[PDB]
Design a protein around this nucleic acid. Sequence first.
RNA 1: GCAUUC
RNA 2: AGCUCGUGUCGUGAGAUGUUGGGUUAAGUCCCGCAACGAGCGCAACCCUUGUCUCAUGUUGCCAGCACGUUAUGGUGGGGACUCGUGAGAGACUGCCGGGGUCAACUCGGAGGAAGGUGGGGAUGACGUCAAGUCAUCAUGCCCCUUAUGUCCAGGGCUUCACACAUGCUACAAUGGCCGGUACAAAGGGCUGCGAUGCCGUGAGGUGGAGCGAAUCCUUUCAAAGCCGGUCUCAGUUCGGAUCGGGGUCUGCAACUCGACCCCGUGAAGUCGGAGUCGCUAGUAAUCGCAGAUCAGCAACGCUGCGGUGAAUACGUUCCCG
RNA 3: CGGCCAACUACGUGCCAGCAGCCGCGGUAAUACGUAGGGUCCGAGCGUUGUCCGGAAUUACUGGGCGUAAAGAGCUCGUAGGUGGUUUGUCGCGUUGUUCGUGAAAACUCACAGCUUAACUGUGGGCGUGCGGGCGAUACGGGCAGACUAGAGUACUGCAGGGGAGACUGGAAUUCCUGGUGUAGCGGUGGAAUGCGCAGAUAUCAGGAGGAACACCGGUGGCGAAGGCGGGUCUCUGGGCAGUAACUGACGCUGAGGAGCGAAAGCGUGGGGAGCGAACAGGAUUAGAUACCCUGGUAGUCCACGCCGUAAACGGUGGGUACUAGGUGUGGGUUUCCUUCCUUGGGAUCCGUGCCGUAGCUAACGCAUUAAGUACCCCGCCUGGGGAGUACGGCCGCAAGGCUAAAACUCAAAGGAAUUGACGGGGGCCCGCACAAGCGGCGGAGCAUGUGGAUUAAUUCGAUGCAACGCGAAGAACCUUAC
Lengths: 135, 208
Amino acid sequence: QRWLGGMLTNFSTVHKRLQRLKELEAMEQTGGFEGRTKKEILMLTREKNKLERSLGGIRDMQKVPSAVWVVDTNKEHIAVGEARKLGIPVIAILDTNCDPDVVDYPIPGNDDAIRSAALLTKVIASAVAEGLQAR
Amino acid sequence: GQKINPHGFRLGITTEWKSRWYADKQYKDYVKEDVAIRKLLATGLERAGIADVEIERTRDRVRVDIHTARPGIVIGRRGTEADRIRADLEKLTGKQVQLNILEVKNPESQAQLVAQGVAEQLSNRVAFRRAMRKAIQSAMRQPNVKGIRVQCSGRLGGAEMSRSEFYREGRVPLHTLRADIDYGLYEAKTTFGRIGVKVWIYKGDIVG
RNA sequence: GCAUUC
RNA sequence: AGCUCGUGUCGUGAGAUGUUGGGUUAAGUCCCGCAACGAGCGCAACCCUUGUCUCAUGUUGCCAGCACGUUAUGGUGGGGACUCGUGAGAGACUGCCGGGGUCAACUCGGAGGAAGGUGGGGAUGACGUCAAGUCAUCAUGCCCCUUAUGUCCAGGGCUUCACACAUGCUACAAUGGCCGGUACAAAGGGCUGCGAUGCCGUGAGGUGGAGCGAAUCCUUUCAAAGCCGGUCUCAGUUCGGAUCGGGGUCUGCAACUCGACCCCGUGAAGUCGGAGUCGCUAGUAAUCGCAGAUCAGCAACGCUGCGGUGAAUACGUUCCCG
RNA sequence: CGGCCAACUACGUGCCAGCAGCCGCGGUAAUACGUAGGGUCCGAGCGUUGUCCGGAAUUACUGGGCGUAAAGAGCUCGUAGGUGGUUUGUCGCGUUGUUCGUGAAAACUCACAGCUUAACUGUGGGCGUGCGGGCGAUACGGGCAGACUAGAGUACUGCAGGGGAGACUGGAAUUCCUGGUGUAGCGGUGGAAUGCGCAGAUAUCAGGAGGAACACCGGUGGCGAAGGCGGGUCUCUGGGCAGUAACUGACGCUGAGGAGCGAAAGCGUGGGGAGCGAACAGGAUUAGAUACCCUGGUAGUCCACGCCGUAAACGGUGGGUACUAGGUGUGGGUUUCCUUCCUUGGGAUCCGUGCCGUAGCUAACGCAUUAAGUACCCCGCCUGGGGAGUACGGCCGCAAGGCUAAAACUCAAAGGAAUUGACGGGGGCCCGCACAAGCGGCGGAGCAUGUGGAUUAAUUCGAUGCAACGCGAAGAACCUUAC
Ligand SMILES: [Mg+2]
Ligand SMILES: [Mg+2]
Ligand SMILES: [Mg+2]
Ligand SMILES: [Mg+2]
Ligand SMILES: [Mg+2]
Ligand SMILES: [Mg+2]
Ligand SMILES: [Mg+2]
Ligand SMILES: [Mg+2]
Ligand SMILES: [Mg+2]
Ligand SMILES: [Mg+2]
Ligand SMILES: [Mg+2]
Ligand SMILES: [Mg+2]
Ligand SMILES: [Mg+2]
Ligand SMILES: [Mg+2]
Ligand SMILES: [Mg+2]
Ligand SMILES: [Mg+2]
Ligand SMILES: [Mg+2]
Ligand SMILES: [Mg+2]
Ligand SMILES: [Mg+2]
Ligand SMILES: [Mg+2]
Ligand SMILES: [Mg+2]
Ligand SMILES: [Mg+2]
Ligand SMILES: [Mg+2]
Ligand SMILES: [Mg+2]
Ligand SMILES: [Mg+2]
Ligand SMILES: [Mg+2]
Ligand SMILES: [Mg+2]
Ligand SMILES: [Mg+2]
Ligand SMILES: [Mg+2]
Ligand SMILES: [Mg+2]
Ligand SMILES: [Mg+2]
Ligand SMILES: [Mg+2]
Ligand SMILES: [Mg+2]
Ligand SMILES: [Mg+2]
Ligand SMILES: [Mg+2]
Ligand SMILES: [Mg+2]
Ligand SMILES: [Mg+2]
Ligand SMILES: [Mg+2]
Ligand SMILES: [Mg+2]
Ligand SMILES: [Mg+2]
Ligand SMILES: [Mg+2]
Ligand SMILES: [Mg+2]
Ligand SMILES: [Mg+2]
Ligand SMILES: [Mg+2]
Ligand SMILES: [Mg+2]
Ligand SMILES: [Mg+2]
Ligand SMILES: [Mg+2]
Ligand SMILES: [Mg+2]
Ligand SMILES: [Mg+2]
Ligand SMILES: [Mg+2]
Ligand SMILES: [Mg+2]
Ligand SMILES: [Mg+2]
Ligand SMILES: [Mg+2]
Ligand SMILES: [Mg+2]
């Protein structure tokens, strides 16, 4: 959805937002809604709303990733830059306008068509799948 | 004169009077006696560390409850200090008193005592930044404390130009009426004058 | 339109 | 309505970012973006008061429905029914409906309701600023006095007066003055205190003291403006009430300097105020009385507060100030 | 015994007496003044002054700079000089090896010895960087004799252009003149007035004269070394670019001095003079207004021929050459493809001119194949700010003045860039009884109250733009009360 600048280099800070997400959700799992006035009921519900849209696929993370796969080095410049500053290997599909020096494992290919996007995403996903199975 | 005294601001809602009685005709005389008592107590157990004095009156009964960090010095094992104070009390008051010398559960949550502790360190030429941070850390470790602010003003470090510095940790919602704010003030005595220590300790919200 | 100085 | 921090990121560095941009709000209020992600003190809310209803409750408060009294009145037997007092609670949330909108904040209008859009008004003053004010509330470093710069007392002064400034009050009148009649408040105060009847004084007041530590009694049964009637007739006056003469009252050991009030006489300036300048957007301004603190008495026309009667105008942001 | 820079407290004077190398310390509480106690560094010495080197890469050979900090000559041409593409042979001058001679002693340095040690002294090496002679090497520089065509120049065929000079000539408009038509205003400003008219203006129509500048085309476009260059035509004339390699065979680059060109103003002589317009008059504005604004108006602006030689003469960036990602406009040529052969079709290539961006550079701003990047050759220039681009001397000029160019003395800075604020008679967007719309006041009178001022034996003290002044005083006859 959206790369929050500092998701990698500021991990200890965004890890607190993850605690707050779990706090809010778990208070709801029991029942923190319909308890107070609409005003408050919504104020609390407007936090999960955004927090999940930006951290859903991170709730599981407990430490910065060991490797980062990127679909568009240019539109994801901040994400790539954070990874390289942490020395985390960047694997990315490079179109003709990307810079090949930022990326360690460059897979040349169209970054802009959903067909080529979905293709290479699933290729690297199957690589991860085979690694988890071979673990 | 920017900040309303925190205790007085909440006096009807979150905090309570430090003396309980009713009198119509005797009100003026009762106040005079109270002034005398509190001046006799505030200048006696200075090194004992007093946080609160509560004075209860009815007929001739004068119940004085003194809250102190350590009651050890406020009552000798022979009762020596209790007897001396009761002697001067009854003498002054005219009636019979029952010193109920108590003790404070969490000395370091108590803003008046935290103020006394900072003030005494400054009286012993301790760097004021040191004493400020010490009090902040001690208070925040304790379970009720959700925030603290400490302010020292005067000739800090013996300088000639007055400084007013403050350190804050956590929440201190001075404008919130339901917020339980404990306020303390103490005047540290130093070769170059007096320096004032104020402490605000937020301990959560009261709904009643 | 006019409007100097500390 | 702003002022900052923690951890990231950018810069050799001071710093920057966050806090900018678009929209929106009374608001750094919130939304949408966004190398930022969060947090803190401010904003808002929590507290008090006012506007509506519900439940609980009847003395010292209320009196509808029933008895008994008035030469006067809930006066009195009594009554919970209306008020009212004070306790608990409900109620306002942009909650609901229609159109605007980023199916966003928020906005314009409508319904319902006592109230509509932070309902009205208090309390509440962020980080700082002005070497602002206060050593005379108090406290305090240093300096100074100790036969005085301490301390007791009588008398005087703080009240001076050729002038000047500032805040008010009373006027210049007929939308008024005076006389007679008559109606409608709120809040508050009271023990060597508030003091009713009656009687005596033109009156200030005297005498004497009922009753009240007071929702009880006193502060008249509590106001004035108001309303009805009569009179004055545009005049420096039946406007104005300064000044000054005489005679008194009260408090106080004592009213000369230097108290307030009363009665008789006196009857100044003043004909709506130059340049300029101040306050106020609704129960507001204007105007009318009432009470309190201090206080033996009062220089109170001051201050703090209470109710009565009640306007005009706001196209608008070109111009002045912040 | 403040920081550099090792070593701190008390008392005494309080912006005084004094200290100090620099920054700076003394204003009745000084680790900086003076004294004392204590401390630190050195020691028969310790400090001060003077003098030279260092620190100072601050004259930079080793070892610095010139876009904005000090610094690129205004631009060219060219003399001496400096510098030199590829290749063959040769000399052995530079360079390099070796050997010999010399480079006195002392000193210096290594060793060793002698004074009791040391200073000192002695002995033996080295050092004495150099120079001369003999002999060896020939990569590189150079000399000498050749060769070559990639640099440079020429020829030929095309092409674009406000490049320059001379002559002639075109229309619009302003002004004036002559004559109609026609009146009482015109003209000018923020608002006015001087001014022009009513003796016939302005306006409108026709004719005539005369001077200067050339609308549209027309651009961050073209040309020129720079300054600069725009109506048209003709004549004379300079440079540039591409294509072809026909020709010469390093003929190149730069250039101290020097010479030439060089906006505008100004100067000399002779013309011209419509408009504009320093000076000069009035008018207005203002406290004044030797200004800004208005009405006029002379030199000048124009031409001919000379002189002058300055400009923010700027890209604030000297010239030549090679190399170092790209993208995208536009001016001038070549060519290949797609083909209609439509042609801004697209590619390649050469030469200009812009914008944006890498690497690299920069204090930053920024520059970035048109460098401020990576390098080589030559020139000019800088060495803290003022005094001063001034004085003196000299050269040049008709003059104005230009060029070359100090010192004394004085300051602890003067500067560049960028940052956060504040401010603006900057901008944008919003607020508040801020104004506007209203209603009632104050400034005039009398009195009350506080204050200034003046009195007084005392009129106690405090507050004294907003934010002091019916404020501390919620109660001055005595008390209060401080006089
Ligand atoms: Mg002057
Ligand atoms: Mg900022
Ligand atoms: Mg800000
Ligand atoms: Mg943002
Ligand atoms: Mg906020
Ligand atoms: Mg608030
Ligand atoms: Mg001051
Ligand atoms: Mg004192
Ligand atoms: Mg006296
Ligand atoms: Mg006075
Ligand atoms: Mg009258
Ligand atoms: Mg008169
Ligand atoms: Mg009249
Ligand atoms: Mg308002
Ligand atoms: Mg009184
Ligand atoms: Mg009123
Ligand atoms: Mg030292
Ligand atoms: Mg040197
Ligand atoms: Mg030197
Ligand atoms: Mg230099
Ligand atoms: Mg250079
Ligand atoms: Mg310069
Ligand atoms: Mg140049
Ligand atoms: Mg030559
Ligand atoms: Mg050569
Ligand atoms: Mg040569
Ligand atoms: Mg020798
Ligand atoms: Mg000519
Ligand atoms: Mg004519
Ligand atoms: Mg004409
Ligand atoms: Mg040359
Ligand atoms: Mg030259
Ligand atoms: Mg000229
Ligand atoms: Mg002349
Ligand atoms: Mg001439
Ligand atoms: Mg002439
Ligand atoms: Mg002129
Ligand atoms: Mg010439
Ligand atoms: Mg020059
Ligand atoms: Mg030029
Ligand atoms: Mg120059
Ligand atoms: Mg160059
Ligand atoms: Mg080009
Ligand atoms: Mg660039
Ligand atoms: Mg540079
Ligand atoms: Mg100079
Ligand atoms: Mg000169
Ligand atoms: Mg000369
Ligand atoms: Mg107005
Ligand atoms: Mg007045
Ligand atoms: Mg007046
Ligand atoms: Mg005074
Ligand atoms: Mg006032
Ligand atoms: Mg007195």
